[PDB]
Design an enzyme around this catalytic site. Structure first.
Site, PDB file in Angstrom:
ATOM      1  CB  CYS A   1      -3.957   3.105  -1.114  1.00 22.19           C
ATOM      2  SG  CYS A   1      -2.834   1.822  -1.691  1.00 22.19           S
TER       3      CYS A   1
ATOM      4  CG  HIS B   1      -1.840  -1.023   1.438  1.00 26.38           C
ATOM      5  ND1 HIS B   1      -2.935  -1.197   0.577  1.00 26.38           N
ATOM      6  CD2 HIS B   1      -1.917  -1.987   2.404  1.00 26.38           C
ATOM      7  CE1 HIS B   1      -3.613  -2.240   1.050  1.00 26.38           C
ATOM      8  NE2 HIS B   1      -3.019  -2.720   2.163  1.00 26.38           N
TER       9      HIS B   1
ATOM     10  CG  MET C   1      -7.009   1.839   0.524  1.00 28.25           C
ATOM     11  SD  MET C   1      -5.842   0.446   0.631  1.00 28.25           S
ATOM     12  CE  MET C   1      -5.041   0.958   2.179  1.00 28.25           C
TER      13      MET C   1
ATOM     14  CG  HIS D   1      -5.045  -1.252  -3.264  1.00 29.01           C
ATOM     15  ND1 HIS D   1      -4.211  -1.442  -2.204  1.00 29.01           N
ATOM     16  CD2 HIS D   1      -4.869  -2.267  -4.152  1.00 29.01           C
ATOM     17  CE1 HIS D   1      -3.544  -2.549  -2.441  1.00 29.01           C
ATOM     18  NE2 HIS D   1      -3.902  -3.083  -3.592  1.00 29.01           N
TER      19      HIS D   1
HETATM   20 CU   LIG Z   1      -3.583  -0.043  -0.885  1.00 22.94          CU
END
Ligand SMILES: [Cu+2]
Length: 99
Positions: free
Chosen positions: A84, A37, A92, A87
């Protein structure tokens, strides 16, 4: 304030994702599940004059290990949207308000 990167059920989420802090209060973003991440502040959704590079990972940077962290204290008052990068479309994302 501790923020998990990935939920305890494996969901690609910041936990919590919306929160408020005061100036200088530590945020510790901690790899939990579903890593790598990162945490990137959106340059066009942070407070007037703030340098995103002082407070952000780059989109290329990654936290690769369970338990690895990115620590940032914010100063300027206002809303800061972050995500992120790998993502983001999965959802996210988050927003921290400094009051
Ligand atoms: Cu992530």
């Amino acid at each position: 304030i501790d923020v998990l990167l990935g939920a305890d059920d494996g969901s690609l989420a910041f936990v919590p994702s919306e929160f408020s802090i005061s100036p200088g209060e530590k945020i510790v973003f901690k790899n939990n599940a579903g890593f790598p991440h990162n945490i990137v502040f959106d340059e066009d959704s942070i407070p007037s004059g703030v340098d995103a590079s002082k407070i952000s990972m780059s989109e290329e940077d990654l936290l690769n290990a369970k338990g690895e962290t990115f620590e940032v204290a914010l100063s300027n008052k206002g809303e800061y949207s972050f995500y992120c990068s790998p993502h983001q479309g999965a959802g996210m994302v988050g927003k921290v308000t400094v009051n």
